[PDB]
Amino acid sequence: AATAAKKADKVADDLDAFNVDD
Amino acid sequence: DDLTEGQKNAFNIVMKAIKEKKHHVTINGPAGTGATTLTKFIIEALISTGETGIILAAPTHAAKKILSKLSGKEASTIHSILKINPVTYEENVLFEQKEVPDLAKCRVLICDEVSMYDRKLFKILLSTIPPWCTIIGIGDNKQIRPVDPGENTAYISPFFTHKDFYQCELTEVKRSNAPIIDVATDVRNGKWIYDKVVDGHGVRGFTGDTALRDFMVNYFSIVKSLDDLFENRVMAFTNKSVDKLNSIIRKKIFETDKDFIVGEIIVMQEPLFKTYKIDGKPVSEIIFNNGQLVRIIEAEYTSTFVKARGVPGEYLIRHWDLTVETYGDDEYYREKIKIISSDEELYKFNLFLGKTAETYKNWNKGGKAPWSDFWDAKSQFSKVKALPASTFHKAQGMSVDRAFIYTPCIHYADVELAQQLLYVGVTRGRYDVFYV
DNA sequence: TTT
Numbered sequence: 001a002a003t004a005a006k007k008a009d010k011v012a013d014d015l016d017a018f019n020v021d022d
Numbered sequence: 023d024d025l026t027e028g029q030k031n032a033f034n035i036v037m038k039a040i041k042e043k044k045h046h047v048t049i050n051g052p053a054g055t056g057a058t059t060l061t062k063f064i065i066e067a068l069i070s071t072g073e074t075g076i077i078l079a080a081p082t083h084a085a086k087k088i089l090s091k092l093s094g095k096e097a098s099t100i101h102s103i104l105k106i107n108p109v110t111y112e113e114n115v116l117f118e119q120k121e122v123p124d125l126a127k128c129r130v131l132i133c134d135e136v137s138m139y140d141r142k143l144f145k146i147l148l149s150t151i152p153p154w155c156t157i158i159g160i161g162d163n164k165q166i167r168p169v170d171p172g173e174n175t176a177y178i179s180p181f182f183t184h185k186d187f188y189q190c191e192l193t194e195v196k197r198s199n200a201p202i203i204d205v206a207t208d209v210r211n212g213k214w215i216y217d218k219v220v221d222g223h224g225v226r227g228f229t230g231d232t233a234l235r236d237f238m239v240n241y242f243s244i245v246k247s248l249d250d251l252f253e254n255r256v257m258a259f260t261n262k263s264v265d266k267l268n269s270i271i272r273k274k275i276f277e278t279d280k281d282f283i284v285g286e287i288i289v290m291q292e293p294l295f296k297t298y299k300i301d302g303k304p305v306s307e308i309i310f311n312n313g314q315l316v317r318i319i320e321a322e323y324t325s326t327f328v329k330a331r332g333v334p335g336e337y338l339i340r341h342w343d344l345t346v347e348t349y350g351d352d353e354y355y356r357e358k359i360k361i362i363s364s365d366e367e368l369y370k371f372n373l374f375l376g377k378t379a380e381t382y383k384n385w386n387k388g389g390k391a392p393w394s395d396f397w398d399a400k401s402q403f404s405k406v407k408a409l410p411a412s413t414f415h416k417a418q419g420m421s422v423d424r425a426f427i428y429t430p431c432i433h434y435a436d437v438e439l440a441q442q443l444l445y446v447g448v449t450r451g452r453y454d455v456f457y458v
Numbered sequence: 459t460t461t
Contacts, residue, residue: 007229008429010233011234011429011458012430014234015234015263015430018234018238018266021270022274109461166460167460169460169461170460170461171460259459259460261459262459291461414460415459416461431459432459434459435460436459
């Protein structure tokens with residue numbers, strides 16, 4: 001699981017639509 | 023008086039070169055080598071001896087303070103001193119009024135943070151200096167290579183390569199164990215990440231499912247709506263990544279969805295020119311420089327009629343009108359600016375500036391083309407950004423307490439900007455550095 | 459990608 005490409009995209013999309021504000 | 027060899031070597035080589043006539047000097051001491059420390063001895067020794075004409079400079083407005091607050095003698099931007107060249111370069115044109123001692127009557131010329139100079143600024147500098155103003159710089163050769171959009175050459179500032187500017191390098195770090203220094207020392211050698219936890223005030227990152235949640239809930243714990251966030255910093259590569267970040271930060275710090283709120287402190291992105299017309303010839307006075315921090319006073323979303331000569335109809339521009347007051351140490355001025363906070367409508371102002379070109383690219387419907395209202399309209403607006411989230415390129419020359427980082431936007435950065443992005447990316451937070 |  002050396003996917004530094006995908007793992008950077010998992011963090012990229014979670015910034016795109018961040019969690020419902022609290 | 024007693025330091026490592028480099029500091030014992032650098033001070034003399036500087037003096038033996040400027041007491042002598044012709045040598046040009048730059049010093050390259052990277053993180054840990056105490057360059058900010060070594061610059062001081064160069065100053066306090068010289069003000070005690072009979073060597074006059076000592077003038078200090080800075081490439082930006084941020085670095086000006088941290089020197090004039092470090093030394094005790096007034097500093098200035100490298101532009102303000104050398105016959106100010108504004109955001110678009112020029113010569114011999116004075117905008118500010120400070121009776122600035124930029125008389126070019128100087129045996130010594132000092133400028134720090136030499137990691138930002140393009141060719142355009144060095145050539146003006148050489149054409150400016152008298153035959154007796156020796157240049158002594160000090161900086162970091164592994165920080166971000168200067169931004170030159172007009173050269174495919176990925177080149178660092180010329181203050182290292184130039185012939186006369188034969189530079190000495192500092193090499194040995196002294197603080198026998200610093201978690202940050204031990205990081206940025208390997209990152210300049212291209213390893214780019216690891217975790218080191220010592221004494222709880224150090225560097226550590228976040229991964230996994232709740233990568234950003236735990237990282238954000240760490241941010242908002244460090245700064246719980248404190249409204250005092252000058253020392254807690256998030257830093258990113260792109261402009262797309264940033265405008266997401268300060269939006270998230272704001273909605274928790276300043277509870278609202280407005281892009282701007284009253285009483286908020288914002289950082290500029292252009293010098294606000296206050297331009298007067300005298301006898302038919304333009305003049306200018308700078309009110310707020312580029313990096314100058316300022317506060318909001320009154321907020322309102324409005325519209326404006328935009329128009330240019332030779333162009334049909336009227337165009338619809340919707341922007342902010344915000345009064346602004348000066349913040350920090352600078353002199354107190356109060357005037358107002360125009361800012362558009364809509365990517366949806368930022369395009370609508372570009373097309374006016376777009377379709378106008380064709381008219382002026384050939385306006386033969388009588389004599390010469392009237393290029394006035396092109397720049398007269400474009401100089402109405404400005405660019406700004408929030409304080410909590412600034413980009414990697416613009417977050418330099420100022421060291422903060424606790425730092426934050428965002429990695430995913432750095433794939434598009436090449437191999438050589440990467441290490442210069444992380445070197446400056448880690449080195450900003452003095453004690454604590456958190457990444458992702 | 460960058461000011």
